[PDB]
């Protein structure tokens with residue numbers, strides 16, 4: 420059984436739960452506020468910053484290397500543009516860094532520093548979702564907040580080096596399936612992907628509480 424299928428199957432239940440967190444439910448319905456959106460985007464900025472520092476650390480490591488697609492997928496530069504848009508030119512000092520974001524970042528560094536064979540779980544959880552449902556969420560954010568089609572403020576959701584998100588997803592999946600894989604590693608990759616999802620759910624629970 421292929422890793423990319425194992426992961427999708429192992430995370431389908433927790434995905435249903437992540438979509439039905441209060442924050443994403445509100446989001447889905449078009450009820451995102453500028454404050455809420457700013458909080459989540461500032462949190463992703465720290466998260467992707469951590470994920471991508473660790474992808475760099477391990478880019479030559481064969482437990483990750485076949486998924487090294489910085490030009491196409493990396494999000495940090497995009498989030499930096501979005502932060503300047505939403506928080507202004509001194510965004511670096513304005514943006515929050517919540518404890519639930521700190522927790523996710525911490526685990527990202529643990530995985531990247533000490534269990535890099537699990538980094539694929541974290542890249543899967545974030546990038547493949549960004550290439551799928553992320554595009555749906557973009558449209559909702561755009562309509563809710565009157566964001567222009569020109570893309571300012573939504574650089575995170577825009578992949579200028581991928582023509583077709585779905586084709587790239589297929590490539591990414593086919594490359595996932597070339598990773599060297601023992602039952603040990605596979606079993607723990609799918610577990611870690613479930614933790615990645617939980618860390619996101621916990622971020623969302625946290626943000627909702629901060630907002631209400």
Ligand code: HEM
Pocket residue numbers: 423426427434437438439443444446447543544545546547548549551552553555615616619620
């Ligand atoms: C309201 C919130 C969300 C909506 C509406 C949503 C929507 C979707 C949709 C429509 C797909 C494609 C389904 C398919 O190809 O069969 C999907 C895939 C995915 N989503 Fe989500 N999603 C949401 C939240 C999340 C969150 C919080 C994460 C992770 C943190 C996530 C991660 C993924 C991943 C990794 C995939 C690809 C699954 C695979 O093909 O292996 N999404 N999302």
